[PDB]
Design a protein around this ligand. Structure first.
Ligand code: ATP
Ligand code: ATP
Ligand code: MG
Ligand code: MG
Ligand code: ZN
Lengths: 154, 343, 302
C-alpha cells in the first residue's frame, strides 16, 4: 500500500495532414504502353466509365463536357452529346478535338501519358484522309483470350 | 409600483386580459431550470441529448420560448455579420395517426422549420428531390425516401449549425407499435445528433421517462434537468408558491385587489403546485370577472373555473409515479459505490 | 512543456476553450491499443476484420482519428506521384429508422465519403442495391484504402432476428473478401453480439495499476486546464471514478463542462460543487456500469 508515481502524459495533436488533390476519376494504367498494341483513347474512356459503373455517354455528358470551354460542349451536356459520338473517330486522331479530350482527361485523371494513346505525335507527318475508320473494328479472338486469361479487355 | 399599471383600469377589458396573458412571472424553479438549460446549451461537451422532464403545466414550453428568444438576441449581431446561420431551431414531435411514429414526417418538418424562415440563400442539399421554389417555400416530393430526407437534414444542419435543436413534447417518440424497442427509436435521433454535432434537447412530461436510461451510450451522451413542481411538505416551496400567488394578485387588473393568499390550500389542491396551471386558472377567473364587470375575486369565482377532483387525482398519480422514479437518494449513491468496490 | 501555456490567460475565454478541447491525452491503454491496431494494419495476417470494442467514453473515435492521421502522414511521401490512392476511409454507421439496418444507405454514404462521382447514375453490370454494391467494390479496389473504418458498428445488429443477426454482416464479409480491404469495426460492447479482436478496457478499480493510470491521466488533465490557479483534483479521485467508471473520454467532457462554467464566471479555480453541478446522474452511471458489466462478462470467456 505504498505510493505510486503520478506520471503525466502527452497529447496527440489530432490534425489531419494536407495531401495532393485526388483525381476525380480513377487512374487505370493504359494497356499497351511501349508496345505496338497500345490502347485507344476512346477505349480508355469506355474502360474508365466501366470502372466507375456508369455508361460512357453519361460520364462524358456529366463530367467531361462541363470541363471543356467550348460552346457546343456546354450546350451539348443537357441534350445528348451526339456530336461527339458521330465524330468519335477524331478523339484518337491528330486534331484539336483529340488534343482537347486528352487534356480534359489528363485534368480529370492527373495522368501524364494519355497523349500516347492518340496520334497527336504524328500531327505534322500524317494526314487525316482515309486514316481512321467510321465503325468499330475488333478481334473476337483477342477479347476471348483476354477474358479467359484474366487480363483486362481493351 | 410593482403592481399593474393604474391606467389599465380605465382601459377596455381586452387590454387588461392581453396584459395579464402576456405577463410572465419569475419563480425560483423556472429560473434555476433556465440557468441550467442555458449553461448546458452554451456548451454541450459531446452531449447529444438534453432531457427536460417536468409535469404538465410546469412551464416547459415557455422556458423553451424564453431560451430560444435569448439565444436569438445573443446571436443577432453575429447573424447580421455572418449569413447562413440560425441560432436556435425548434419543432414539436407529432403524435402519429397510425400506431408507429412517423420519422419521414419528422425529417420533412424539421427541414421545413429549419429552412423556410430564411432568405433565398442558395444551398444544394445532396438529394435530388428536395429544393427551393420561386416563392421560397421548401418542397419535398412524396417520392423522396426517408433516409434521403435524413441526409438532406444532416447537410442543412451542418451548414446552418444551430446552437440547439428543441423537440417539444418528445414523449411522442415512444408511440411505437409491435415489437420495436424504445432504444431503437433513440439511436436514430442519436445518430442524427452525432454526425451533425447538434445538441438535441427533448422536452416532455413524466411519460418521457421511458427514454431515461436505455443503453450506456444513450445514458452517457445525455444530460437531464428536472422541472420540479412546488411540493407541500417542504415549507420553502410553500412560501415560494405563496409569493407567486401574491405576485399574481398584485398584477390582476381589477379595481380592488382580492386576497388570494388565504385560499392557498385551495389553489394548491387544484394546481398541484404547478405555476402554469395556476396561471390559466387565474386567467379564467379574471376573464369571467371582467365579463361580469366585477371589482373583486371571490371563492365561488375560482370554484366556477376550477379543475375537477378526478383530473387532479390523475395528475397527482402520474406526478408521484414520475417523481419517485426520478428521485435520487444516498442509497442510489451507496449501492453504486459498492458496485464498483469503491466503498 | 508538460503544462498548458501561460500566455493564454490574457487571451479570450473562447481561445482557452478551443485549446483545451483539442488536447488528447495519451493514456497507456490508448497508445497500447493504437500500437496493436497499427501492427494489425501493417501486417494483416490474411484477416479482413479488426473488430474493436469498448464502452462509450473509452476514446474509440479519437483513436480512429489518430490512426487516420498517422496512416495519411505515413503514406504522404508516395501520394505525390500516385493519385486515386486515398489512404484511409472512415465512416459512421447509420442507426436505422425501421427495424432492419439499411444497406443501400450504407453503400451510398460510403460512396459519398470517397468522393465518387455520379452516384445517382450508377448501373448494374449483370442482394441490396447491386449497382451501388458493385460501385463501392470497384471504388475500394481502385482507390485502394489501407483501412475502412466504420465507427458506431453496433448499429449493424439492428435486425431483431437470431437467425439473421450473424447473416446481416454477409454484405461486409463479401465486400471485404473480393476487394481485399481491411474493415475495422469500432463499436461499443453491443458488437459482441456476433477477424481480429481488440479490447479498449477502462481502468477497473480492482487492479491498482489502473488506479495509478487513472490518477496519472487526472493529474495531466488538471495540469492542462487553463485557469489562473491550478485546481486540485487528485484528492477526489474516488469521486472522479464514481461518476466516470474509469473512462478517459467522458472525464474529458466532464472537465470541459466544468472549465466552461468556470470561464463563463471569470473564475480562477475548480471546487467540488463545480464538478457536482456538471456531474453525471446517479442513475446514468448505474446504467452505464450495467452495460459495461454485461460486455465484460461477455468478453470474459477464455
Ligand atoms: N412562469 C410562468 N409565468 C407566467 N405564465 C406561465 C409561466 N409558466 C407557464 N405559464 C403559462 O402557463 C400556460 C401553459 O404553460 P406551458 O405551456 O409553458 O406548460 P408546459 O409545462 O410546457 O406543459 P405542456 O406539457 O402542456 O406543454 C401558458 O399560458 C403559459 O404562458
Ligand atoms: N483521450 C482523450 N483525450 C481527450 N479528449 C478525448 C479523449 N477521448 C475522447 N475525447 C473526447 O471525447 C469526444 C469523442 O467521444 P469519445 O472518444 O470520448 O467517445 P467514444 O466512446 O470513443 O465514442 P462513441 O461513444 O460514440 O462510440 C471528443 O470531444 C474528444 O475530444
Ligand atoms: Mg408544451
Ligand atoms: Mg464515438
Ligand atoms: Zn486478335
Amino acid at each position: 500500500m505504498l505510493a505510486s508515481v503520478l506520471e503525466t502524459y502527452e497529447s496527440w495533436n489530432l490534425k489531419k495532414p494536407l495531401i495532393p488533390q485526388r483525381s476525380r476519376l480513377y487512374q487505370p494504367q493504359p494497356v499497351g504502353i511501349g508496345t505496338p498494341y497500345i490502347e485507344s483513347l476512346t477505349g480508355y474512356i469506355t474502360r474508365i466509365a466501366e470502372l466507375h459503373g456508369v455508361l460512357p455517354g453519361v460520364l462524358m455528358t456529366r463530367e467531361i463536357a462541363p470541363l471543356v470551354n467550348k460552346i457546343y460542349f456546354q450546350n451539348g451536356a443537357n441534350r445528348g452529346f451526339r456530336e461527339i459520338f458521330n465524330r468519335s473517330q477524331a478523339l484518337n486522331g491528330m486534331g484539336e478535338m483529340a488534343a482537347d479530350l486528352v487534356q480534359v482527361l489528363q485534368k480529370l485523371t492527373l495522368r501524364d501519358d494519355l497523349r500516347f494513346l492518340t496520334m497527336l505525335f504524328w500531327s505534322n507527318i500524317l494526314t487525316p484522309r482515309n486514316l481512321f475508320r467510321t465503325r468499330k473494328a475488333w478481334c473476337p479472338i483477342c477479347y476471348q483470350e483476354r477474358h479467359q486469361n484474366g487480363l483486362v479487355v481493351y | 409600483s410593482t403592481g399593474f399599471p393604474l391606467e389599465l383600469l380605465t382601459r377596455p377589458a381586452t387590454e387588461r386580459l392581453a396584459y395579464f396573458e402576456n405577463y410572465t412571472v419569475a419563480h425560483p424553479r423556472l429560473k434555476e431550470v433556465y440557468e441550467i438549460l442555458m449553461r448546458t446549451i452554451a456548451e454541450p461537451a459531446g452531449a447529444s441529448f438534453i432531457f427536460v422532464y417536468g409535469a404538465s403545466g410546469v412551464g416547459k414550453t415557455t422556458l423553451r420560448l424564453r431560451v430560444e428568444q435569448k439565444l436569438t438576441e445573443l446571436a443577432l449581431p453575429k447573424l447580421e455579420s455572418d449569413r447562413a446561420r440560425v441560432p436556435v431551431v425548434g419543432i414539436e414531435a407529432i403524435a402519429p395517426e397510425s400506431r408507429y411514429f412517423n420519422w419521414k414526417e419528422y425529417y420533412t418538418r424539421a427541414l421545413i422549420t429549419l429552412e423556410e424562415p430564411l432568405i433565398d440563400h442558395k444551398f444544394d442539399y445532396g438529394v435530388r428531390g428536395i429544393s427551393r421554389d420561386n416563392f421560397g417555400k421548401i418542397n419535398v416530393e412524396s417520392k423522396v425516401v426517408a433516409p434521403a430526407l435524413r441526409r438532406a437534414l444532416e447537410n442543412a444542419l451542418i451548414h446552418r449549425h444551430p446552437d440547439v435543436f428543441f423537440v417539444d413534447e418528445a414523449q411522442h417518440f415512444g408511440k411505437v407499435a409491435s415489437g420495436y424497442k424504445l432504444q431503437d427509436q433513440l439511436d436514430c435521433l442519436k445518430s442524427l445528433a452525432n454526425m451533425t454535432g447538434i445538441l438535441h434537447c427533448l422536452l416532455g412530461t413524466y411519460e418521457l421517462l421511458t427514454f431515461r436510461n436505455l443503453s450506456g451510450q444513450l445514458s452517457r451522451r445525455s444530460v437531464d434537468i428536472h422541472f420540479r413542481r412546488y411540493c407541500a411538505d417542504s415549507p420553502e416551496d410553500v412560501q415560494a408558491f405563496k409569493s407567486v400567488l401574491l405576485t399574481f394578485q398584485q398584477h390582476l387588473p381589477l379595481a380592488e385587489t382580492p386576497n388570494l393568499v388565504d385560499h392557498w390550500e385551495y389553489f394548491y389542491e387544484r394546481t398541484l403546485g404547478c405555476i402554469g396551471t395556476l396561471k390559466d386558472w387565474l386567467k379564467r377567473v379574471l376573464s369571467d370577472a371582467l365579463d361580469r364587470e366585477a371589482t373583486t375575486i371571490t371563492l365561488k369565482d375560482l370554484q366556477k373555473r376550477a379543475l375537477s377532483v378526478a383530473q387532479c387525482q390523475k395528475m397527482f398519480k402520474e406526478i408521484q409515479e414520475g417523481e419517485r422514479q426520478l428521485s435520487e437518494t444516498e442509497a442510489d449513491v451507496q449501492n453504486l459505490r459498492s458496485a464498483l468496490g469503491l466503498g
